Design a protein around this ligand. Sequence first.
Ligand SMILES: O=c1ccn([C@H]2C[C@H](O)[C@@H](COP(=O)(O)NP(=O)(O)OP(=O)(O)O)O2)c(=O)[nH]1
Ligand SMILES: [Cl-]
Ligand SMILES: [Cl-]
Ligand SMILES: [Cl-]
Ligand SMILES: [Cl-]
Ligand SMILES: [Cl-]
Ligand SMILES: [Cl-]
Ligand SMILES: [Mg+2]
Ligand SMILES: [Mg+2]
Ligand code: NA
Ligand code: NA
Length: 326
Amino acid sequence: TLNGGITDMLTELANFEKNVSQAIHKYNAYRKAASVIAKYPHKIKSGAEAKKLPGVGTKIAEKIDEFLATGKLRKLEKIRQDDTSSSINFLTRVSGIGPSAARKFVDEGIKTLEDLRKNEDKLNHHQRIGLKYFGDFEKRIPREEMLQMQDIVLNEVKKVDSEYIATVCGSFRRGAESSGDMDVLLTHPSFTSESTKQPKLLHQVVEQLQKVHFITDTLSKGETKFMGVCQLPSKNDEKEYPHRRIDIALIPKDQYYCGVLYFTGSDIFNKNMRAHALEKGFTINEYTIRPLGVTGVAGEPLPVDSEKDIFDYIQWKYREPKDRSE
DNA sequence: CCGACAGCGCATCAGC
DNA sequence: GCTGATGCGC
DNA sequence: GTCGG
Ligand SMILES: O=c1ccn([C@H]2C[C@H](O)[C@@H](COP(=O)(O)NP(=O)(O)OP(=O)(O)O)O2)c(=O)[nH]1
Ligand SMILES: [Cl-]
Ligand SMILES: [Cl-]
Ligand SMILES: [Cl-]
Ligand SMILES: [Cl-]
Ligand SMILES: [Cl-]
Ligand SMILES: [Cl-]
Ligand SMILES: [Mg+2]
Ligand SMILES: [Mg+2]
Ligand code: NA
Ligand code: NA
């Protein structure tokens, strides 16, 4: 956190541009600058020094000079004071309320937690659950709880079919000491890129986790993605654990390595890595790495037997999950 | 200058 | 119902 | 907002 003040500022600006301005490219630019600065091993002394880093331009360099000189940014100071911006930024903290819905709600004069709660009938299913657990979803998950959660998920999945493999990915796999949620990658030999020899593969797992009262709510559910809510069981006379977000992704077993690379992240590491692939003439998604033709049309999937294979194609030295937290 | 910015799953909606 | 566009989030 | 060509 050598540059915590600056990265915080950039993140606030990123959030402003996404939530309020609905300028998604400015949002991404700011997050990229924060990320490159976050890993810079020196306490930044000036915007010029930061402008050396890729992704920090002239505008951000000026902002860093203001911030360094004064400890603040007038631009942010004004935004913080704007009722409409504040209201929109707030509402978007509810899972399922994005920039669009937030602005629509404010138009109707629904702009506090209190307002949302009194107008529950104006929320879609996802939004209702996000409101229900608003506080809980703000809390981080200690790694020690993540371990307990992993134990349950892995054991309950084994109980459904001993041929499942469940892997906890996301920030947990990168070694983080706390996570925002739990991400679980699921494979079964019946489901490959070549055929789906068993239906309800994801449904079955979700059902068992609900049966044992681990999964408590559902935000979305399809054949390959589940997004919902879970909770650890508490002991006698113990205060309950907060409800947690859980995401599960069922990937073709033969495409496990691209899948685990994707779900391990970080999001910015993936954006960086995918961008580089493109420069090298490949395209990477959660399923495959394929060459791009002279026309730009993705060719056939290249053979992948490890995460490192993927790195090798794009001429990157291998990076352990712990070193992918960008 | 200016195009491109990673790539995709599920919920919801319009239009037919 | 379908297909396609948009919102939201991974 | 930043960058490569
Ligand atoms: O925009 C995204 C978001 C997520 N992902 C990926 C990478 C990421 O690590 C993974 C899990 O998504 P999360 O939102 O759960 N982020 P993560 O687990 O890395 O951190 P945390 O959950 O602790 O906030 O899916 C993307 O590829 N693009
Ligand atoms: Cl933009
Ligand atoms: Cl500030
Ligand atoms: Cl502004
Ligand atoms: Cl695991
Ligand atoms: Cl693919
Ligand atoms: Cl690691
Ligand atoms: Mg996560
Ligand atoms: Mg997640
Ligand atoms: Na730069
Ligand atoms: Na939200």
